[PDB]
Automatic annotation (TrEMBL), chain A:
One of its GO terms (molecular function) is identical protein binding. GO terms for cellular component: chromosome, centromeric core domain; mitotic spindle; monopolin complex; nuclear envelope; nucleolus. GO terms for biological process: attachment of mitotic spindle microtubules to kinetochore; meiotic sister chromatid cohesion, centromeric; meiotic sister chromatid segregation; protein localization to nucleolar rDNA repeats; rDNA chromatin condensation; spindle attachment to meiosis I kinetochore. This is Monopolin complex subunit CSM1. Residues 5-88 form the Monopolin complex subunit Csm1/Pcs1 C-terminal domain. The lineage of its organism: Eukaryota, Fungi, Dikarya, Ascomycota, Saccharomycotina. It comes from Candida glabrata (Yeast).
TrEMBL record, chain B:
The chain holds residues 29 to 65 of 473 of the full protein. It comes from the Eukaryota. Signal peptide: none annotated. This is Kinetochore-associated protein DSN1.
Automatic annotation (TrEMBL), chain C:
The chain holds residues 69 to 179 of 181 of the full protein. This is Monopolin complex subunit CSM1. It comes from the Eukaryota. Coiled coil: none annotated. It comes from Candida glabrata. GO terms for molecular function: identical protein binding; microtubule site clamp. GO terms for cellular component: chromosome, centromeric core domain; mitotic spindle; monopolin complex; nuclear envelope; nucleolus. One of its GO terms (biological process) is meiotic sister chromatid segregation. Residues 7-97 form the Monopolin complex subunit Csm1/Pcs1 C-terminal domain.
């Protein structure tokens, strides 16, 4: 079992790639990419522990061309265009929301 | 010889100076949402 | 959650709802003993990847083998899944790697019913 083997599995399984990661003083952070042929969204997930764990979602529009972001504008609810905080128990719900939005 | 306080970290990676800044800003400005039902 | 690989697997377990209990490779391919689900229901299954060498390239062809694990589930849990999941998810299935995300989506929508 290697990290590359796990990352490969989940790329093909649930369409999520992890690109860059780091731990700073606030928590654990993951530059993340999600989607398929229909649409792709890049974003940052941060896990900050206070013990309860909060997730910070940061949308990343730089990699998107002008055309795929006007599609993104139609597919995404407004909150997925803004930086969010939510408890860890809702992460899967978040993934499903993002999947359904991209798949539109 | 009095010891010191520290914090443990994983090997997930050292951030840049900018990313440290980004994290604080993103936490501070994040909109709270409870679920996505 | 100290080791980096545990952190990665914890991330995907909370994000995609899939826990990988074991990873191994024997003469039958590369295998993952997994669970997928949440409060609404859990499905235990093995994912197998059978790499066959392509004719003209180092790029391997991969076939996925899905083996559902029902033997250790209770009859009560097994009848709860039967209402949510189509019959083929109770059988051993094989399909190309490219269809793996569709399999996962079909699994996820069934468990969330």
């Amino acid at each position: 079992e290697t990290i590359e083997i796990i990352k490969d599995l989940f790329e093909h399984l649930c369409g999520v790639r992890v690109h860059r990661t780091y731990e700073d003083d606030t928590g654990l952070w993951f530059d993340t990419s999600q989607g398929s042929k229909n649409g792709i969204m890049d974003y940052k997930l941060g896990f900050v522990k206070s013990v309860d764990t909060e997730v910070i979602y940061v949308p990343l529009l730089k990699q998107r061309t002008a055309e795929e972001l006007q599609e993104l504008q139609k597919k995404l609810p407004d909150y997925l265009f803004e930086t969010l905080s939510f408890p860890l128990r809702s992460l899967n719900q978040f993934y499903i929301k993002m999947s359904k939005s991209l798949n539109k | 010889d009095e010891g010191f306080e520290f914090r443990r970290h994983s090997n997930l990676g050292v951030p840049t100076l900018g990313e440290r800044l980004d994290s604080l800003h993103e936490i501070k400005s994040a909109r709270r949402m409870d679920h996505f039902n």
